[PDB]
Design a protein around this ligand. Structure first.
Ligand SMILES: CCCCCCCCCCCCCCCCCC(=O)OC[C@H](COP(=O)([O-])OCC(O)COP(=O)([O-])OC[C@@H](COC(=O)CCCCCCCCCCCCCCCCC)OC(=O)CCCCCCCCCCCCCCCCC)OC(=O)CCCCCCCCCCCCCCCCC
Ligand SMILES: CCCCCCCCCCCCCCCCCC(=O)OC[C@H](COP(=O)([O-])OCC(O)COP(=O)([O-])OC[C@@H](COC(=O)CCCCCCCCCCCCCCCCC)OC(=O)CCCCCCCCCCCCCCCCC)OC(=O)CCCCCCCCCCCCCCCCC
Ligand SMILES: CCCCCCCCCCCCCCCCC[C@@H](O)O[C@H](CO[C@H](O)CCCCCCCCCCCCCCC)COP(=O)(O)OCC[N+](C)(C)C
Ligand SMILES: CCCCCCCCCCCCCCCCC[C@@H](O)O[C@H](CO[C@H](O)CCCCCCCCCCCCCCC)COP(=O)(O)OCC[N+](C)(C)C
Ligand SMILES: CCCCCCCC/C=C\CCCCCCCC(=O)OC[C@H](COP(=O)(O)OCCN)OC(=O)CCCCCCC/C=C\CCCCCCCC
Ligand SMILES: CCCCCCCC/C=C\CCCCCCCC(=O)O[C@H](COC(=O)CCCCCCC/C=C/CCCCCCCC)COP(=O)(O)OCCN
Ligand SMILES: CCCCCCCC/C=C\CCCCCCCC(=O)O[C@H](COC(=O)CCCCCCC/C=C/CCCCCCCC)COP(=O)(O)OCCN
Lengths: 99, 303, 347, 113, 171, 83, 105, 129, 98
């Protein structure tokens, strides 16, 4: 409830300020007188998406450290990070990071 | 007495980002062997008021041919995110105490690029669209490293709670435990907020400017809390508040100093810098920080 | 593509199918399907061209929709019974939706429209892999839950598949579309015996895989895509045309060739359950498959079509690359009727 | 060149040692707090059982009063074939209570920030 | 199917412990050390019976024992305990680390008066044994009778009679 | 031996970031299997009481199970205190 | 079809997540642990058909625990009748249900 | 009771799905998708799954729908199902999710391999030729 | 079965209908697929959290990951189509026919 009130207050204040800034100069009358589609941008977007997915996999590490299976958890975390590094390396060597 | 707290957290932030422009002009002027604004008011103190009044009384240059919907939506989202990204912060007691505060900050920072995307799309120009695309790509690329560094550092904290960061650094700053991660985090915050050397690019313009400067102050306060902890005495929080504010101001002055003291990167140069210098080191240091508590039997408590 | 990358993608496709077949969790089965779909796309796009891209995007759209439907069915089944193990579905709506998802994955009618176009756009090698290997995971999943599937839905979809394959095969001229419609009809035949005996389903799957592997390898050997390109083959390698005609006769269900073993056996099983009208209908429908196979045989081997002068130069050069297991595939798809009882091996 | 790397590594090692000691102390404090909670648990369990049973009894009394006119209603009829004790839902306890405590019970922990 | 049985409100009446959470946390260690036997009996009964309605007497016993413990504390060491729980109460997290000094004063006072030794680290979390005369419940799950298993017949394999017997195949 | 040293010297020039990253990653992979404190970390994790310890029913044949928390029987956390 | 590699090798690749009552972390119990345990023990080594026919009581209780349809129906009926009576005016709620009660710890 | 806040959020979710399901001007359908995703995250957070809701709000909105918008621009009744007891001194959702590394070794292996193969597949497809 | 689950399944059905309608703009088809995925995530999360099936909390995250990967794949294909035609209208994919 408190966070909902905070978000509503923030949005309301921002909207009110924007509209008053937009309408204060509007009271006074005045004169009132493609193809390229670069592939590199799409490639960097896709790379960001995939690395974001791997980061999502990596996120629960702070709570994963208390399991009594420290060897298995450590092996799995290092496996995930090694796969992330290997994906980056494959993208690097095959000229996937060129402008 | 909750709305009072929200207003007392919102209005001072806006005043701070109002006077940050004056402080930045003065600092750059004195670094460039001149004086900043010192005619309007005693020492330029009335300059932000004059700038705001001039901006709000100037006619807006609405394209009259674009999508007015997204054109008016984008500043709303930018300012709303900039203001709502302050509530988890403990100084020293957060306004809203959340278990997963850091993830909330990361999520809002990730959402921040929608304003850039929509402003570029609604600008109705191919050049503006290209600029927006470059800005979006840079922001997301650097936010990847932001997230990785954040989780790697929090591995020594115990959880995602922001308040616990005060307890972790009670005896020693986190700057000494991991300085390389801190330096890469500082550069990532510089590049995320579009600041030199990474700044390739009436009403809504002022809206965007306030959002950007509020993001600057937020990022610097977050870095101060995360890496430069202050002693917290429960019976007198004013000491912690003073220390935290001083560290935030020092980091902001460092931001202005860095802007004034360096040339700017190219787009491809900064993309290369990230993808080929920060990300490999970030992965290596994340592995090191995963393995370190198990090596030294110093796993943080909370779970 | 690089040979190492191609080998890795093929291993990933096989690993996804294996994960689907050897897993006892619905989530792991869905993961296996996703891995199969993810690695299968570049195999279609090995020879880059607009037709391959369009076929690949059609295949991706259909498979993604099927996977989403399958996941929704899994979610509903979990909701109405907190079980993840692949067993009795415990819900009618979940079973119906999962049946539609597996029909989309398999290609049974009326979800059959994508098969002819995807087969036509993509190459012969890609088509061969898609036609035989892809069927193994959905068929295994259907066999694992055959005790819960509604006989009405499966039987009507199988009948519609047989009818549609038989009718659509008559019109086509390109060989790849003929193979697509043949696959549709064979799967209509094969899924009709799922509620009764899954061993017959597996036996029909094995026989069909052998026959279509042999026919696709023969089509690759004599690089023919349209009917006339196949008619030109007799002037260079008559043995290939003769073997192809024998395999085509086998694929039509003519005894004593191997292709008669499944149909016959399948009919027998549906006669044990007092189902008489349907096997008769499917036999008279498979007569249409026989008809267009016979037309292809007339065009290819039993008559000598006009040749071309330049073909003389092709007389001097031999096939540099020989594909192993082609003679074995032909023999297994033509002369294994006398060993029919070996189906008791629960193959 | 060597001196800068040596200084950096020395700072890293000092920070690691200090954090090791502090984190071990935090582990000990956490164990102490958990032991205090463990010592306090049985009283809380007893009070919770008593409160749940009292709420169920009050709901049963109200059901007996209200359902008096419904013809085929059996007051306090279980919906499970087994006779084993089954933990009641939130609605089984706060079904007939006022709305504010319904909201408190269902949403207070989530909404408390 | 069936009628649930619930104890009358007179069966749930007991002298409640009317102290706040901080007061309970201040004396949690000594309460656990001294009042251990009724607490352990109640908790074992709760875990074995799997039914709140079969453990009312142990709940009343633990309430009474806690009241006796707090009455002793009030009689002997009221003021140091008051200071200690006030300090514990002030903090938001109610941390023991904040005011070890007041805790030391309270511990020494209660060791002087009642001779109580504060349990060390790793002692209140031990698993213990309880000697009780309550009979072990024979079927706490109220389960039915398990259905009879399949015959699972056995024997020596013999060759199939007349082979496969599949149509005309004689082998 | 000489070729490997020459290659490492070459990589340490004009590419120090990759060398540092690989060295740190290799150290993080290798070291935990050699450190003697990892078993201490496992024991510390095991010693944290998250759930209520349910007492066992006494039958007269449990000498290793203490009857009171103060009793000497049972696991002790003196090793943790000394750390 | 189903090549049971796990049971052949005893690997336990994916069997721990199949059911609610199988070794949860920190021994956190499922909401319907008891009912699922009862049904599983009823239907083990019996076969699909016999388990469906004979252990229907346990499965019905399990589904009732999972979805609580009958409990919702009963509570809705009670609430509707109480609303009708309070509309006619023959029923008044006690202080306990009006917030005027004496709360207990 | 808050006018069935779960029901209000579910209805707003359905309204957003209807709005973006008509597929008008794919950028506007995207905007409807962000609205629906925000409402769904609100539902999940209200239910009690804070980590999963924040997971949606971070991954889905920040990365995946952002990539969607990037590519587009480049071109032309309740409250009764709940529990009764407590979770102890931890959050059950966080423990279950963090059990991915100690229990779900198979899941981690297959997901990592799938992601690596996805990288390879994307490079192969976008290579061109 | 409460109204929340009914509304979620209704949302999934609406998204499926939108995907199958196919007016134009294959990007809209991908958006409909991802709306279906989001509905699946919400429903699975609610079901798993309601029953305290702790070990199943892994399932949504995993799901999301895989689904997002598919989305990426789909986008790639879309791009190629545009690079061959200049635009992503669905009616342009008519070279292959039954
Ligand atoms: C019941 C079971 C039913 C099975 C279903 C049918 C199976 C058909 C799929 C198999 C793969 C398709 C295939 O190989 O081409 C079709 C092939 C036709 O040969 P082709 O047209 O000359 O091949 C053209 C390729 O495109 C030319 O490919 P290339 O130029 O890229 O050459 C690379 C080559 C060479 O591979 C290498 O370079 C080895 C290097 C290893 C790298 C290690 C990386 C691992 C990490 O590797 C391959 O061709 C793929 C082999 C995959 C390994 C499978 C085990 O026909 C068959 O393979 C028939 C298979 C027989 C039936 C299966 C077994 C009998 C039952
Ligand atoms: C040679 C070197 C080794 C050696 O000397 O071993 C001696 C070895 C000694 O074995 P035995 O146990 O002492 O003899 C027991 C009695 O013979 C009789 O023992 P049985 O009655 O207990 O076992 C016979 C039974 C079980 O036996 C079988 O299941 C095998 C079925 C045929 C056996 C073929 C063996 C040689 C194939 C040569 C190529 C034929 C073309 O066959 C059947 O149940 C009736 C099936 C009739 C045909 C299957 C239905 C398909 C109709 C269309 C066929 C066209 C195929 C595709 C074209 O005998 C042989 O291997 C010689 C051939 C076996 C003929 C017996 C089967 C009679 C019924 C079919 C006659 C078809 C004859 C075709 C011409 C064969 C030309 C050679
Ligand atoms: C043309 C006809 C098809 C031919 C197919 C190719 C022939 C070559 C294949 C080489 C051997 C195949 C298998 C390799 C042996 C080891 C694998 C073995 O362990 O698998 C066993 C099983 O063995 C195979 O199933 C038998 C393979 C034999 C296939 C031939 C039967 C064809 C019948 C009609 C044609 C007669 C033969 C013609 C010449 C080959 C385990 O069975 P099980 O895990 O417990 O049950 C799983 C099935 N369920 C789930 C339905 C219950
Ligand atoms: C066995 C066959 C080997 C050859 C064939 C390989 C086929 C494909 C490769 C994938 C199969 C690998 C098998 C791994 C199965 C995981 C389960 C098993 O390993 O036990 C685990 C043991 O963990 C091991 O550390 C697994 C490490 C293996 C992962 C490292 C390398 C994996 C590479 C596999 C291919 C992936 C892509 C290629 C990478 C190079 C569980 O540990 P445990 O503590 O008892 O149980 C915890 C649960 N509790 C809490 C109930 C007790
Ligand atoms: C907009 C998104 C804002 C929501 C982010 C909230 C993140 C959060 O952690 O809050 C969870 C908070 C407390 O949880 P914990 O921190 O884990 O602590 C519990 C124990 N004290 O719980 C709640 O927020 C309860 C209220 C939830 C209902 C409302 C949530 C917000 C819904 C917003 C819908 C509108 C979105 C519009 C789309 C955005 C377009 C870019
Ligand atoms: C015994 C076990 C010990 C464990 C090992 C740990 C030790 C690790 C030792 C090495 C770690 C060092 C990592 C530091 C980060 C490296 C970044 C980097 O290398 O990038 C630079 C580039 O970095 C930059 O130039 C960025 C400049 C951006 C402007 C900022 C100027 C810096 C001045 C500001 C002060 C920084 C403040 C830091 C403290 C912040 C407080 C919170 C190199 O790029 P190039 O020159 O192009 O070379 C690559 C091609 N060969
Ligand atoms: C087994 C551990 C693995 C995990 C740890 C590392 C994780 C993350 C780090 C790796 C991320 C991806 C790396 C991708 C590698 C790509 C290599 C490459 O192609 O780069 C070459 C250049 O790189 C090389 O020279 C080859 C590799 C460099 C050295 C590799 C490691 C050397 C040995 C490491 C260990 C050192 C010895 C240990 C000493 C211990 C202390 C005494 C091309 O240069 P460009 O940048 O493209 O050109 C720009 C200028 N025109």
């Amino acid at each position: 409830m408190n966070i909902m009130l905070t978000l509503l207050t923030n949005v309301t204040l921002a909207s009110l300020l924007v509209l008053i800034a937009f309408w204060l100069p509007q009271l006074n009358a005045y004169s009132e007188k493609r193809l390229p589609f670069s592939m590199k941008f799409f490639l960097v977007a896709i790379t960001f998406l995939l690395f974001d997915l791997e980061i999502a996999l990596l996120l629960p590490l702070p709570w994963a450290s208390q399991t009594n299976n420290l060897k298995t958890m450590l092996t799995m975390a290092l496996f995930l990070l090694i796969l992330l590094a290997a994906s980056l390396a494959y993208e690097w060597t095959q000229k996937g990071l060129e402008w | 007495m909750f709305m009072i707290n929200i207003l007392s957290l919102i209005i001072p932030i806006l005043l701070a980002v109002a006077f940050l422009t004056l402080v930045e002009r003065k600092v750059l002027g004195y670094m460039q062997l001149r004086k900043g604004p010192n005619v309007v008011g005693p020492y330029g103190l009335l300059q932000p008021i004059a700038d705001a009044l001039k901006l709000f009384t100037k006619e807006p240059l609405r394209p009259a041919t674009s999508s007015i919907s997204m054109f008016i939506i984008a500043p709303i989202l930018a300012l709303s995110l900039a203001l709502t990204m302050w509530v988890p912060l403990p100084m020293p007691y957060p306004l809203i105490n959340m278990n997963l505060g850091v993830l909330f900050m990361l999520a809002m920072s990730s959402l921040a690029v929608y304003s850039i995307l929509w402003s570029g799309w609604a600008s109705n120009s191919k050049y503006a669209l290209i600029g927006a695309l470059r800005a979006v790509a840079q922001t997301i690329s650097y936010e990847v490293t932001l997230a990785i560094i954040l989780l790697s550092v929090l591995l020594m904290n115990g959880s995602y709670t922001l308040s616990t960061l005060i307890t972790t650094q009670e005896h020693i700053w986190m700057i000494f435990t991991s300085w390389p991660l801190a330096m890469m985090w500082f550069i990532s915050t510089l590049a995320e907020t579009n600041r030199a050397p990474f700044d390739l690019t009436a009403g809504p313009f002022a809206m965007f400017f306030m959002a950007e400067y509020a993001n600057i102050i937020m990022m610097n306060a977050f870095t101060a809390i995360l890496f430069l902890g202050a002693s917290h005495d429960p019976h007198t929080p004013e000491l912690y508040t003073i220390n935290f504010v001083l560290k935030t101001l020092a980091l902001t002055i460092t931001f202005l100093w860095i802007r004034a003291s360096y040339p700017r990167f190219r787009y491809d140069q900064l993309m290369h810098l990230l993808w080929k210098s920060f990300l490999p080191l970030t992965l290596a240091l994340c592995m090191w920080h995963i393995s370190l508590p198990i090596m030294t039997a110093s796993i943080p408590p909370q779970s | 593509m690089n040979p190492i990358i191609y080998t890795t993608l093929i291993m990933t496709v096989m690993s996804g199918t294996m994960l689907v077949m050897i897993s006892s969790h619905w989530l792991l089965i869905w993961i296996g399907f996703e891995m199969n779909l993810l690695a299968m796309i570049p195999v279609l796009m090995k020879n880059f061209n607009p037709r391959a891209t369009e076929a690949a995007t059609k295949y991706f759209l259909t498979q993604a929709t099927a996977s989403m439907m399958l996941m929704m069915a899994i979610i509903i089944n979990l909701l109405y019974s907190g079980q993840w193990t692949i067993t009795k579905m415990f819900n009618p709506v979940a079973m119906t939706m999962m049946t539609m998802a597996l029909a989309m994955k398999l290609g049974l009618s009326p979800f059959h429209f994508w098969v002819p176009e995807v087969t036509q756009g993509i190459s012969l090698q890609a088509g061969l892999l898609l036609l035989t290997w892809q069927k193994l995971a959905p068929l295994s999943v259907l066999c694992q839950i055959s005790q819960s599937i509604n006989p009405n839905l499966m039987l009507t979809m199988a009948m519609l598949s047989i009818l549609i394959g038989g009718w659509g095969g008559l019109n086509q001229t390109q060989l790849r579309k003929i193979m697509a419609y043949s696959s549709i009809a064979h799967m209509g035949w094969m899924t009709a015996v799922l509620p009764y005996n899954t061993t017959m389903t597996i036996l029909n799957l094995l026989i069909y895989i052998t026959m279509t592997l042999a026919m696709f390898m023969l089509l690759i050997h004599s690089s023919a895509t349209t009917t006339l390109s196949l008619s030109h083959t007799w002037n260079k390698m008559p043995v290939i045309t003769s073997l192809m005609m024998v395999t085509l006769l086998s694929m039509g269900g003519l005894p004593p060739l191997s292709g008669f073993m499944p149909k016959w056996m399948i009919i027998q099983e549906m006669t044990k359950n007092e189902s008489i009208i349907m096997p008769t209908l499917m036999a008279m429908t498979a007569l249409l498959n026989l008809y267009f196979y016979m037309r292809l045989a007339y065009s290819s081997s039993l008559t000598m079509f006009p040749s071309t002068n330049n073909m003389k130069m092709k007389w001097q050069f031999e096939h540099t690359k020989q594909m192993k297991l082609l003679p074995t595939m032909i023999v297994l798809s033509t002369l294994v009727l006398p060993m029919t009882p070996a189906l008791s091996s629960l193959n | 060149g060597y001196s800068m790397f040596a200084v950096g590594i020395g700072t890293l090692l000092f920070g690691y040692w200090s954090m090791m000691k502090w984190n071990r102390e935090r582990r000990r404090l956490q164990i102490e707090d958990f032991e205090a909670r463990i010592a306090l648990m049985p009283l809380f369990q007893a009070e919770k059982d008593r409160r749940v049973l009292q709420m169920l009894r009050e709901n049963l009394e109200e059901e007996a009063i209200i359902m008096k006119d419904v013809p085929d209603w059996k007051v306090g009829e279980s919906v499970f074939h087994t006779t084993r004790w089954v933990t009641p839902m939130m609605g089984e306890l706060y079904g007939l209570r006022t709305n504010e405590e319904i909201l408190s019970a269902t949403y207070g922990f989530i909404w408390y920030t | 199917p069936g009628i649930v049985e619930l104890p009358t409100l007179e069966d749930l009446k007991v002298q409640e412990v009317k102290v706040s959470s901080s007061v309970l946390k201040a004396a949690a260690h000594h309460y656990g050390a001294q009042c251990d036997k009724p607490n352990k009996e109640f908790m074992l009964c709760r875990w074995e019976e799997k039914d709140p309605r079969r453990c009312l007497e142990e709940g009343k016993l633990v309430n009474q024992c806690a009241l006796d413990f707090f009455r002793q504390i009030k009689r002997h060491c009221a003021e140091p305990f008051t200071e200690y729980w006030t300090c514990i109460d002030y903090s938001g997290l109610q941390l023991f680390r904040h005011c070890r000094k007041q805790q030391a004063k309270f511990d020494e006072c209660v060791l002087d008066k009642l001779g109580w030794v504060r349990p060390d680290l790793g002692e209140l979390s031990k698993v213990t044994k309880v000697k009780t005369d309550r009979p072990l419940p024979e079927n706490p799950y109220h389960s039915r009778a398990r259905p009879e298993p399949n015959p699972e017949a056995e024997g020596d394999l013999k060759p199939a009679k007349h082979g496969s017997r599949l149509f005309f195949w004689t082998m | 031996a000489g070729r490997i040293a020459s290659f490492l010297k070459n990589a340490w020039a004009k590419e120090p970031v990759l060398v540092a990253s690989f060295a740190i990653g290799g150290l993080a992979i290798i070291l935990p299997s050699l450190s003697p404190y990892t078993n201490y970390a496992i024991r510390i994790n095991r010693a944290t009481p998250y759930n209520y310890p349910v007492p066992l029913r006494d039958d007269g044949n449990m000498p290793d199970v203490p009857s009171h928390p103060q009793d000497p029987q049972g696991p002790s956390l003196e090793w943790l205190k000394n750390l | 079809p189903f090549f049971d590699v796990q049971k052949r090798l005893g690997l336990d690749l994916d069997r721990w997540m199949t059911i609610q009552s199988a070794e949860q972390p920190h021994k956190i119990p499922g909401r319907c642990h008891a009912f699922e345990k009862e049904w599983i023990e009823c239907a083990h080594g019996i076969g699909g058909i016999r388990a469906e026919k004979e252990c229907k009581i346990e499965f019905d209780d399990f589904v009732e625990c999972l979805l609580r349809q009958k409990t919702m129906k009963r509570l809705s009926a009670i609430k509707r009748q109480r609303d009708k009576l309070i509309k006619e005016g023959k029923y008044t709620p006690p202080p306990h249900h009006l917030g005027k009660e004496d709360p207990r710890p | 009771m808050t006018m069935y806040i779960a029901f209000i959020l579910s209805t707003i979710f359905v309204i957003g799905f209807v709005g973006f399901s008509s597929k008008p001007s794919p950028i506007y359908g995207g905007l409807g998708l962000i609205v629906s995703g925000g409402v769904g995250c609100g539902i999940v957070l209200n239910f009690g799954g804070s980590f999963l809701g924040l997971m949606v709000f971070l991954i889905y909105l920040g990365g995946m729908l952002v990539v969607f918008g990037y590519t587009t621009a480049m071109a032309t009744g309740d409250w009764v199902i709940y529990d009764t007891g407590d979770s102890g001194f931890f959050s059950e959702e966080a423990m279950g999710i963090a059990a991915l590394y100690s229990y779900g070794t198979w899941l981690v292996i297959v997901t990592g391999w799938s992601l690596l193969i996805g990288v390879v597949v994307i490079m192969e497809i976008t290579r061109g030729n | 079965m409460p109204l929340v689950y009914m509304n979620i399944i209704m949302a999934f059905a609406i998204a499926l209908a939108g995907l199958l309608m196919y007016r134009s703009h294959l990007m809209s088809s991908l958006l409909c697929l991802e709306g279906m995925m989001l509905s699946l995530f919400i429903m699975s999360t609610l079901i798993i959290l309601n029953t305290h099936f702790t070990l199943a909390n892994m399932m949504p995250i995993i799901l999301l990951v895989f689904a997002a990967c598919e989305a990426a794949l789909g986008l790639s294909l879309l791009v190629m189509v545009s690079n061959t035609y200049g635009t992503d209208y669905v009616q342009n994919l008519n070279l292959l026919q039954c």
